[PDB]
Amino acid sequence: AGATLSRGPAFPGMGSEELRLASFYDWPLTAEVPPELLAAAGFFHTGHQDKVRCFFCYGGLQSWKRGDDPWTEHAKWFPSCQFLLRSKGRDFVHSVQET
Ligand SMILES: [Zn+2]
Numbered sequence: 001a002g003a004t005l006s007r008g009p010a011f012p013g014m015g016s017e018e019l020r021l022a023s024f025y026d027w028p029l030t031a032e033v034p035p036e037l038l039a040a041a042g043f044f045h046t047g048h049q050d051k052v053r054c055f056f057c058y059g060g061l062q063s064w065k066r067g068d069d070p071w072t073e074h075a076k077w078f079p080s081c082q083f084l085l086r087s088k089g090r091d092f093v094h095s096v097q098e099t
Pocket of ligand 1: 042054055056057058059074078081082083084
């Protein structure tokens with residue numbers, strides 16, 4: 001039994017946090033979450049509003065709000081993302097999924 005998750009990042013170039021940060025150069029004024037937290041959690045900015053995607057799983061999120069936790073949102077929506085699991089561990093993800 002079992003297909004395996006592919007090991008290739010959706011967008012390998014955006015694999016660098018520093019590079020991910022650059023993408024937030026036009027992260028909007030009305031946006032409510034800081035790019036540092038976003039880039040750290042693997043997201044980079046696309047489009048001109050508040051859409052982001054994870055460089056690894058390509059999970060796409062928008063409508064960011066004051067207090068929203070990027071790492072948490074990550075585990076909420078894309079539990080199997082290998083970047084999320086290497087960075088935060090099995091327990092953290094399981095913890096967010098179970099609530
Ligand atoms: Zn991801």
